[PDB]
Amino acid sequence: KSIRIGPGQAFYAXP
Amino acid sequence: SDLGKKLLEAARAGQDDEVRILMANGADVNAKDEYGATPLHLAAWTGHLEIVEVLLKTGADVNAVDSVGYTPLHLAAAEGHLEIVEVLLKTGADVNAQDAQGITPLHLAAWYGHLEIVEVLLKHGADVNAQDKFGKTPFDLAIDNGNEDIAEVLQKAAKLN
Ligand SMILES: [Ca+2]
Ligand SMILES: [Ca+2]
Ligand code: NA
Ligand code: NA
């Protein structure tokens, strides 16, 4: 999972 | 135009009076960057409350979607920007907007641990058990990322619909 998301950055993306 | 780029940068960098100057000079309020974000997404994401209010007053589409289906409310809910989440919901944000992965603002606030935001979303009619593309509810995301206090808030809203 990402510690933050942002525009264009999908929530489900591997880690 | 040229002004759209300048508007995106000012919104993103929190230059509130530069935003006001470009809007009065004809800048497209719904200009989009390479990833589909409008100035309203960038201000909501970055916690620029005054700029959010200015863009909403000068015609910004409150439910604009970027290249992966995020609305400004998704980004404010993920970052934990409470006042921005409130103003967006008072100015017609879709509380149940799903991105391309079926993720809602409630899913994001549950995962990233923003309890006040979760309560404000429920107050404004958030579907407590919205399922993403993996069948996950905001409750499952709160449990999965160790926010059991948010899980309790969500299981009480579900029993009492
Ligand atoms: Ca000011
Ligand atoms: Ca439901
Ligand atoms: Na499910
Ligand atoms: Na915990």
Residue numbers in the entry:
A (entry chain B): 1 to 15
B (entry chain A): 12 to 172
What did the publication describing this PDB structure actually write?
The V3 loop of the HIV-1 envelope (Env) protein elicits a vigorous, but largely non-neutralizing antibody response directed to the V3-crown, whereas rare broadly neutralizing antibodies (bnAbs) target the V3-base. Challenging this view, we present V3-crown directed broadly neutralizing Designed Ankyrin Repeat Proteins (bnDs) matching the breadth of V3-base bnAbs. While most bnAbs target prefusion Env, V3-crown bnDs bind open Env conformations triggered by CD4 engagement. BnDs achieve breadth by focusing on highly conserved residues that are accessible in two distinct V3 conformations, one of which resembles CCR5-bound V3.
In contrast, V3-IY and V3-IF mimetics in complex with the three bnDs and 63_B7 adopted conformations that were different from their original design. Since bnD.1 and bnD.3 also target the V3 post-CD4 engagement, the conformation adopted by V3 in complex with these DARPins must either be a transitory intermediate state that occurs prior to CCR5 binding or an induced fit upon binding an intermediate. This conformation will hereinafter be referred to as Inter-CCR5-V3. In contrast, the Inter-CCR5-V3 conformation was sampled less often in the MD simulations, suggesting that bnD.1 and bnD.3 must have the means to efficiently interact with V3 prior to the adoption of this V3 state. Despite different preferences for the Inter- or Post-CCR5-V3 conformation, the bnDs overlapped in their contact patterns, engaging mainly with R/H308, I309, P313, F317, and Y318. Six of these bonds were established with the V3-crown peptide backbone, and as a result, this should make bnD.3 less sensitive to V3 sequence variations. These features probably contribute collectively to the observed higher neutralization breadth of bnD.3 compared to bnD.1, which covers a BSA similar to bnD.3, but only forms four H-bonds with V3.
